Amino acid sequence: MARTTPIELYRNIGIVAHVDAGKTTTTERILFYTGVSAATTAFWQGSTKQFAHKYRFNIIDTPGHVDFTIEVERSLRVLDGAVVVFSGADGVEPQSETVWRQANKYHVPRLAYINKMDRQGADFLRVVKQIDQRLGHHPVPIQLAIGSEENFMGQIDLVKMKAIYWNDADQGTSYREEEIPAELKALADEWRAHMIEAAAEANDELTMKFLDGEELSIEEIKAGLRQRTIANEIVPTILGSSFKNKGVPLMLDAVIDYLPAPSEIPAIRGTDPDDEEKHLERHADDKEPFSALAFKIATDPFVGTLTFARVYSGVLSSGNAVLNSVKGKKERIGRMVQMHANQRAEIKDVCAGDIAALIGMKDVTTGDTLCDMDKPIILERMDFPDPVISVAVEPKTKADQEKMGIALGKLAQEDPSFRVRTDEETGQTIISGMGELHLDIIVDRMRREFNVEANIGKPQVAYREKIRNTCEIEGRFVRQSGGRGQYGHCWIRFAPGDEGKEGLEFINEIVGGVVPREYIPAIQKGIEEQMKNGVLAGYPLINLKAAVFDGSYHDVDSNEMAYKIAASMATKQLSQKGGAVLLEPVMKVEVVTPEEYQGDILGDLSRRRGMIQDGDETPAGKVIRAEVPLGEMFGYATSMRSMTQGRASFSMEFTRYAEAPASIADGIVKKSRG
Amino acid sequence: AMARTTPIELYRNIGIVAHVDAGKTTTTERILFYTGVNITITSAATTAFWQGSTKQFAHKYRFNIIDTPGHVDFTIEVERSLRVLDGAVVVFSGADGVEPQSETVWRQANKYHVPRLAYINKMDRQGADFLRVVKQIDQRLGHHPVPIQLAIGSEENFMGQIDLVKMKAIYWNDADQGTSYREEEIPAELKALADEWRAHMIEAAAEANDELTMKFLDGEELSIEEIKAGLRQRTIANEIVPTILGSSFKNKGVPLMLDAVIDYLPAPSEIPAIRGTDPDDEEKHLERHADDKEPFSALAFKIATDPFVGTLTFARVYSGVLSSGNAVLNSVKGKKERIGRMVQMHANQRAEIKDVCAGDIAALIGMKDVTTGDTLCDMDKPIILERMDFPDPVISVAVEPKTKADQEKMGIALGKLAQEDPSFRVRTDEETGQTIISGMGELHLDIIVDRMRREFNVEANIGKPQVAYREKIRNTCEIEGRFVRQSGGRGQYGHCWIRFAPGDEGKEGLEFINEIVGGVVPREYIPAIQKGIEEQMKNGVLAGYPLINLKAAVFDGSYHDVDSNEMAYKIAASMATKQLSQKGGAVLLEPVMKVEVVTPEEYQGDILGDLSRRRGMIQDGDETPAGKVIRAEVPLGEMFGYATSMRSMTQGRASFSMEFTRYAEAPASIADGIVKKSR
């Protein structure tokens, strides 16, 4: 049959650890113990092979920096359970609190691995409190530390209530079970009470056994912590030293014991390919219609392009014809492969909750959905703010023009957050992105990986436009030079769209009027076409409301094209009668700084035409929130580092567009237009 | 002699040394508060008075609070501040304890034998434990901490300390904002712990000298003055660190911490003399003792520049006396300076003065060309207290203001930023009349440009980075310098043969030697010939770039009884140097940088291949628990945009650093093009 292993034995996990937390060492140690790419499949039957069946682990590689928010979001939808790794000395860093909140947004069950207990300043219970106070979750330690820093030897398994020491003989692969030292028995009982009390709340059956004063069994306690972890109500917290080889194996047992299988988490959410406002879902079952997400597009030197796909429902098989719901084009599934630690296992059937790499995919971009052509769905669409910043790139030679095209094409497949266009007005290639850093990365990879020699302009703000005056304009396009004529005529009432709405909200008020129905769509298409070219300074209108209330028709000269042009001419007059204003992208800035530099940051954000919002107070770090125009945030990283001696950190993301002041506006309006 | 108003024994040059987030600002603001009663204007050095928490001292001591940077990395700014302060008050968090970023400045403090006190701040916050941090100073910092206080109550229950010298509990009255305190008996729950640490305090003070050691071994109890005299001798010798504690935010302990400065930190005459070198010979080591009688020497440790206020040059007088109207020497620039008005920054006002004696600090107004790190001293017995080993700028960019109206304002701003940071230079290439700023790297220029926009309100655009090329010769040749002219009634005669050769590997500048002793060329003109070579060395000979080093020896020449003059020989010497382009076989040099990259083993290959692609030369690397260390020598011109490249290839997980190491002949590809442009 197509299914090879029960779904209950799958574990789609991702190690979520930031700079200086032990990501690389921990990931390399996992592939080591399991032995005795975007996604690696490994097997694990327990530290002591104490489990009846051999579980299949799909290690999903998560990004190192929160900077790219959609990259982190996508990885959290691919993994089912996450192993958040923190430094026992550094504790909870701000780059950890960011991915943690996004994890809550996708109800991602998770384990907390307090790594590096051998380094100085290491304190397990100290980091546990931060998860409860800062991250605001409910950590449930199932282990305690034995020895501090250089004297760290192992942990105490609160479920077995027996000390765990690691034998360096076989590189910490095995361990010995001794009794807990009397100097920690008192502390062990205290946290075992909180563990059992936390597991008892799982269901009524365990809660009643707890209130009766009956001691819960090892299986009952684990079943309780599991139900609460899968419900994201607690976080089994374990500890160890990946570099010293002490704790990793128990951390792999915890994945089986408390992280969920692809069928124990909520169904994947999606939308109808023909309607963005129609929400659908897919259950983790081989019987349900096929749906998969291309979460990563890598390059390989032996099989070529590798499109890594996460199958949420149905079965993906070689030879099957699936649909690319985002492009609306059919795809023929060819060879498929699963990346192992050392091997590269070829396969032809990938069932629900499993992951595999697809070979020879024509036109598949990261974030695209592969699904059944009879019952299609889009698992990831929009949710991306249009590019807020752009840079003009021009190749020095013709050889750079062809090479630049190939480079942006492949870079576009890996990163869908950036766009490319040719400015026919200046004949320069314009690349648009989410920020200065994002464009610097695209330009850097284009020069190093594709050898593209080119000149780049300074970053430009991706301005927009909108109207405020409600006015009625006449669209007229007439010509009859000879025995052939063209006739397009329509009166349109323009008005500002509601804040939040995108595109055009067109309304036909002359339903069954003199202007035939088949031309109405052409009038709408004509307005939308001019909205992209702009009306004030060549920038596109965010939204608009148009209503055709009158017009005329010619029995022989009227055609869809004549009305489309007529509608465009009426929209071009929206520059005077509309009283349009230039809009600029505003970013939601959040700065974490010691109380000492709060004033310097507040004054600087205010200087950047920023709008200060309510600020919070965190452990030894004030949280300063503000809404600042992107154009005033160029080089903020450098400014923040000077004013805070590199002690402060910040993050910003698009929030909305806002009218730019006259100072900037006037200059940009008279830059090319008038 | 009558210039001094306060004995030197009553001075205390102190600096609060605290890891970021240890209570440095709160502690410094509370010090200026208690000293003002026994907003506050910020300044590089603040002078305050303190006669004790209870005014228990006979004389009123003068405290010079030196503002220290506190960078996590040990920069030249931290080193300089340790030489300015005489005693340091190292502040640690009772909860955070001793962080590794503190162990770096601590060792550099040992390098300059800086006596110091340990103030364990924030005893009210959670995780606070005094004796816990004390052990870290002994285990991690490897020093000998001597607690003279113990904590009363932990965290939210923290009320005060126990003075082991007086053996009396100290509780602070919030009535007058912790300015006063009450002396009660030690609680029975800490009497046992108090005796234990008093034994270690007395035992640590007894080792001070033989007199106290013998009285201790005889079983005789040491008196209060004997114990304090012992801890003081040990602290000034940097053998112990009197450790005190408190909560600056809760106003409990700061006043006793000020008493400890008087009781255990040293006066400007109890620390070793300041070291230095002869301005004309870097291998000649000199020193200056803290005495008004010794020759004058001072260090400009900070230049406070403002876009509206006048520049303030803060100077630390180590020896002699600095007086208004005196003509001192700027041994680093070799230019005379006229001391104008001087002021000392107090808590609120600015007290004016005209005499700054040894061990004292003051701000100088209207200074012509005085840069951070320059030395001001006696013209007859000069000295350089700090060599500016800073390598000349390796990168440069053309800077243009967004509004041409800010051209004059931009020039003034870049000028003041150059006085604060001597690694940054500003010039106007007479060839284009464009403003060119030079620095140590792209990041360094970004910081200078950012500060110019925020602190000086001047926005500007920078062009693409340019390599700060240099030149050098390799051929040993003899060239004839000749400048002869006769306008008829007036003549000009300059003639001299010079033997040029490449300078010594480690020597910089010009090594001029006059070997035509008793020749036709009079001695009065030799200095002009030297000045002529040095002037042409800066203008370059191959592509308009300056020669790193050179050796010149005038071996022959001629002289005219009426037409010869210093200017004619200076020009003659320059013409001879310009011919170093053909006969010298000069080559265009480019700065090579020592690059160090810390990355997880995973991206080692990508970084090695990228450094090699940048014409880099890989060196032996190490394996640190924080990641693999990749070292390489790479031309700066190939390192532009490295920060961005490293972030792409390592997903921002890797970090790097680079510093000038040496100059190397640039490849023909670039050279040929630049050489042909100069003509």
Pick the closest to residue B195 from B217, B218, B224, B167 (CA basis): B167
Asked if B618 and B611 count as a contact pair (C-beta separation under 8 A), the reply is: yes
Tokens for B158, please give them: 């923290």
CB contact under 8 Å between B602 and A647, yes or no, is no
CB contact under 8 Å between B651 and A20, yes or no, is no
Cα–Cα distances in Å, from B153 out to A295, B96, B200, B514?
A: 55, 18, 22, 77
Residue entry with tokens 């397990």: A124
Q: Give strand ranges (E) for A89-183.
A: 110-115, 139-141, 143-146, 154-157, 162-166, 175-178
Tokens for A177, please give them: 């079970």
Separate counts of helices (H) and strands (E) for chain B = 15, 38
The residues after which chain A has a C–N gap greater than 2.5 Å are 36
**CATH fold of A1-266:** Rossmann fold (3.40.50)
Q: Rounded to whole angstroms, how far apart are CA atoms B66 and B361?
A: 9
For chain A, give percent helix, strand, coil, nearest 5: 30, 35, 35
Tokens for B187, please give them: 């609680």
Q: Rounded to whole angstroms, how far apart are CA atoms B589 and B469?
A: 6
Q: Rounded to whole angstroms, how far apart are CA atoms A289 and A315?
A: 8
Sheet containing strand B549-557, edge to edge, reads B477-486, B491-501, B549-557, B509-514
Asked if B590 and B635 count as a contact pair (C-beta separation under 8 A), the reply is: yes
Kindly report the backbone phi and psi dihedral angles of residue A58, in degrees, each rounded to the nearest multiple of 5, phi listed first. -105, 95
Q: Which amino acid is at A303?
A: V
Neighbours of A383 (CB within 10 A): 8
Size of interface A-B (CB pairs under 8 A): 74
The DSSP string of A228-240 is HHHTTS-EEEEE-
Q: Rounded to whole angstroms, how far apart are CA atoms A438 and A639?
A: 19
Tokens for B140, please give them: 């991690």
Report the CATH number of the A585-655 domain.
Answer: 3.30.70.240
B279 DSSP 8-state letter: T
Q: Rounded to whole angstroms, how far apart are CA atoms B18 and B7?
A: 30
End-to-end CA distance of chain A, in Å? 70
Asked if B251 and B174 count as a contact pair (C-beta separation under 8 A), the reply is: yes
The helix or strand, by DSSP H or E, that contains position A96, with its residue range, turns out to be helix A94-105
The DSSP string of B13-29 is EEEEEE-SSSSHHHHHH
Domain B1-272 part of CATH 3.30.1490.20: no
Q: Rounded to whole angstroms, how far apart are CA atoms A302 and A304?
A: 6
Q: Which residues of chain B are within 8 Å of residue A298 when distances are taken between CB atoms?
A: none
Tokens for B568, please give them: 């004619």
- The C-alpha of A472 sits at a distance from chain B's nearest C-alpha, in angstroms, of 42
Interface mutation target, options A618, A647, A651, A664, chain B, most CBs of B under 10 Å: A647
DSSP bridge pairs for B471: B547, B588
B176 DSSP 8-state letter: G
A287 DSSP 8-state letter: T
- Please report the sign of the dihedral spanned by the C-alpha atoms of residue A71, residue A74, residue A76, residue A79: negative
**CATH fold of B273-388:** Elongation Factor Tu (Ef-tu); domain 3 (2.40.30)
Pick the closest to residue B28 from B102, B119, B114, B95 (CA basis): B119
Pick the closest to residue A287 from A1, A27, A39, A546 (CA basis): A1
- B403 touching A, CB under 8 A? no
Q: Rounded to whole angstroms, how far apart are CA atoms B443 and A646?
A: 13
B247 DSSP 8-state letter: B
Tokens for B431, please give them: 């060839």
> Which residues touch A139 (CB under 8 Å, ≥6 apart)?
A112, A128, A131, A132, A234, A235, A237
Q: Which amino acid is at A368?
A: D
What b/e readout covers A558-596, taking b as 16+ CB neighbours within 10 angstroms?
bbbebbbbbbbbbbebbbebbebbbbbbbbebbbbbbeb
Q: Which of B450, B601, B613 sits opposite A635 (nearest CB)?
A: B450
What b/e readout covers B353-385, taking b as 16+ CB neighbours within 10 angstroms?
bebbbbbbbbbbeebeebbbbbbbbbeebbbbb
Out of 3.40.50.2000, 2.40.30.10, 3.40.50.300, 1.10.1200.10, which CATH number does the structure's domain A267-385 have?
2.40.30.10
Tokens for B111, please give them: 């390098």
DSSP bridge pairs for A429: A393, A422
- Rg over alpha carbons for chain A, rounded to the nearest Å, is 30
> Which residues touch A507 (CB under 8 Å, ≥6 apart)?
A545, A546, A547
- B602 touching A, CB under 8 A? yes
Tokens for B622, please give them: 């190490």
Q: Rounded to whole angstroms, how far apart are CA atoms A431 and A419?
A: 6
End-to-end CA distance of chain B, in Å? 62
Chain mean position to CA A154 = 36
Q: Look at residue A646 and give its three-state secondary structure.
A: coil
The DSSP string of A546-599 is EEEEEE---TTTB-HHHHHHHHHHHHHGGGTSS--EEEEEEEEEEEEE-GGGHH
The helix or strand, by DSSP H or E, that contains position A337, with its residue range, turns out to be strand A336-339
Tokens for A429, please give them: 């290639």
Sheet containing strand B312-319, edge to edge, reads B335-338, B327-330, B375-377, B297-304, B312-319, B361-365, B342-345, B350-353
Report the CATH number of the B594-660 domain.
Answer: 3.30.70.240
- A148 touching B, CB under 8 A? no
Neighbours of A48 (CB within 10 A): 11
- The C-alpha of B547 sits at a distance from chain A's nearest C-alpha, in angstroms, of 32
Kindly report the backbone phi and psi dihedral angles of residue B546, in degrees, each rounded to the nearest multiple of 5, phi listed first. -70, 145
Pick the closest to residue B623 from A25, A110, A316 (CA basis): A25
CB contact under 8 Å between A645 and B100, yes or no, is no
Q: Which of A120, A639, A646 sits opposite B140 (nearest CB)?
A: A120
CB contact under 8 Å between A444 and B24, yes or no, is no
- Please report the sign of the dihedral spanned by the C-alpha atoms of residue B568, residue B574, residue B577, residue B582: negative
Q: Rounded to whole angstroms, how far apart are CA atoms A145 and A164?
A: 10
Asked if B319 and B288 count as a contact pair (C-beta separation under 8 A), the reply is: yes
The DSSP string of A156-200 is EETTTTEEEEE-GGGTSSSEEEEPPPHHHHHHHHHHHHHHHHHHH
Experimental method: X-ray
- A645 touching B, CB under 8 A? yes
- B651 touching A, CB under 8 A? yes
Residue entry with tokens 């592969």: A370
DSSP bridge pairs for B660: B593
Q: Look at residue A219 and give its three-state secondary structure.
A: helix
> Which residues touch A404 (CB under 8 Å, ≥6 apart)?
A393, A395, A429, A446, A450, A452, A454
Asked if B305 and B419 count as a contact pair (C-beta separation under 8 A), the reply is: yes
- The C-alpha of B187 sits at a distance from chain A's nearest C-alpha, in angstroms, of 28
Q: Rounded to whole angstroms, how far apart are CA atoms B654 and B646?
A: 7
Q: Rounded to whole angstroms, how far apart are CA atoms A642 and B454?
A: 10
Cα–Cα distances in Å, from A418 out to A134, A295, A430, B360, B366?
A: 34, 16, 11, 60, 54
Length of chain A, please? 674
Q: Annotation-wise, does B22 bind a ligand?
A: yes
Resolution, given in Å to one decimal, reads 2.6
The backbone region for A220, taken as left when phi is positive above 0, alpha when psi lies in -120 to 50, beta otherwise, is: alpha
Q: Rounded to whole angstroms, how far apart are CA atoms B202 and B198?
A: 6
**CATH fold of A466-584+656-674:** Ribosomal Protein S5; domain 2 (3.30.230)
Q: Give strand ranges (E) for B110-251.
A: 116-121, 145-147, 149-152, 160-163, 168-172, 181-184, 241-245
Tokens for A412, please give them: 């576009």
> Which residues touch A671 (CB under 8 Å, ≥6 apart)?
A537
The residues after which chain B has a C–N gap greater than 2.5 Å are 38
Q: Annotation-wise, does B21 bind a ligand?
A: yes
Tokens for B602, please give them: 């995973």
- B24 touching A, CB under 8 A? yes
B389-471 sits in which CATH class? Answer: alpha beta
Residue entry with tokens 């095209």: A405
> Which residues touch B452 (CB under 8 Å, ≥6 apart)?
B410, B413, B414, B417, B458, B460
- B97 touching A, CB under 8 A? yes
Q: Rounded to whole angstroms, how far apart are CA atoms A624 and A112?
A: 28
- A441 touching B, CB under 8 A? yes
Chain mean position to CA B15 = 14
Kindly report the backbone phi and psi dihedral angles of residue B515, in degrees, each rounded to the nearest multiple of 5, phi listed first. -110, 10
CB contact under 8 Å between A444 and B648, yes or no, is yes
DSSP bridge pairs for B662: B592
Q: Which residues of chain B are within 8 Å of residue A442 when distances are taken between CB atoms?
A: none
Asked if A267 and A279 count as a contact pair (C-beta separation under 8 A), the reply is: no
Q: Which of B20, B454, B645 sits opposite A647 (nearest CB)?
A: B20
Q: Give strand ranges (E) for A418-552.
A: 419-423, 428-433, 454-456, 460-461, 464-466, 471-479, 486-495, 503-508, 543-551
Kindly report the backbone phi and psi dihedral angles of residue A306, in degrees, each rounded to the nearest multiple of 5, phi listed first. -120, 115
Neighbours of A116 (CB within 10 A): 28
Tokens for B594, please give them: 């020592």
Neighbours of A457 (CB within 10 A): 13
Torsion angle in degrees (nearest 10) through CA of B120, B121, B122, B124: 70
Tell me whether domains A386-465 and A585-655 share a fold.
yes
DSSP bridge pairs for A477: A488
Cα–Cα distances in Å, from A339 out to A63, A335, A344, B234, B397?
A: 18, 13, 5, 65, 48
Asked if A669 and A582 count as a contact pair (C-beta separation under 8 A), the reply is: yes
Tokens for B379, please give them: 């013209």
Cα–Cα distances in Å, from A394 out to A177, A457, B350, B537?
A: 67, 9, 58, 40
Cα–Cα distances in Å, from B450 out to A460, A603, A604?
A: 19, 15, 12
CA-based max dimension of chain A: 107
The DSSP string of B41-81 is PP-SEEEEEE--TTS-SSS-EEEEEEPP---SS--HHHHHH
Q: Rounded to whole angstroms, how far apart are CA atoms B357 and B342?
A: 12
- A638 touching B, CB under 8 A? yes
Pick the closest to residue A635 from A623, A619, A652, A622 (CA basis): A652
Asked if A85 and A232 count as a contact pair (C-beta separation under 8 A), the reply is: no
Pick the closest to residue B635 from B658, B607, B603 (CA basis): B658
Calculate ∠ Cα A339-A341-A345, nearest 5°.
40
Q: Which residues of chain A are within 8 Å of residue B400 when distances are taken between CB atoms?
A: none
Tokens for A298, please give them: 């890598």
3-state secondary structure B460-517: EEECCCEECCEEECCCCEEEEEEEEEECCCCEEEEEEEEEEECCCCCCCEEEEEECCC
Residue entry with tokens 């563990």: A195
B303 DSSP 8-state letter: E
Show me where the domains of chain B are located: 1-272, 273-388, 389-471, 472-593+661-679, 594-660
Architecture (CATH level 2) of domain A386-465: 2-Layer Sandwich (3.30)
Domain B472-593+661-679 part of CATH 3.30.230.10: yes
Pick the closest to residue A58 from A38, A35, A74 (CA basis): A38
CB contact under 8 Å between B625 and A126, yes or no, is no
Q: Which residues of chain A are within 8 Å of residue B650 when distances are taken between CB atoms?
A: 64
Asked if A148 and A122 count as a contact pair (C-beta separation under 8 A), the reply is: yes
Length of chain B, please? 679
Long-range contacts of A201-205 (CB under 8 A, 24+ apart): A201/A228, A201/A233, A202/A226, A202/A227, A202/A228, A203/A227
Kindly report the backbone phi and psi dihedral angles of residue A485, in degrees, each rounded to the nearest multiple of 5, phi listed first. -130, 170
Q: Annotation-wise, does B295 bind a ligand?
A: no
DSSP bridge pairs for B589: B470, B665
CB contact under 8 Å between A635 and B97, yes or no, is no
Tokens for A466, please give them: 């909108």
Neighbours of B210 (CB within 10 A): 9
Q: Rounded to whole angstroms, how far apart are CA atoms B12 and B261?
A: 7
> Which residues touch A413 (CB under 8 Å, ≥6 apart)?
A297, A364, A365, A366
Q: Rounded to whole angstroms, how far apart are CA atoms A558 and A174?
A: 85
Chain mean position to CA A411 = 17
Angle between helices B566-578 and B526-539 (to 10 degrees): 40
Q: Rounded to whole angstroms, how far apart are CA atoms A106 and A99?
A: 11
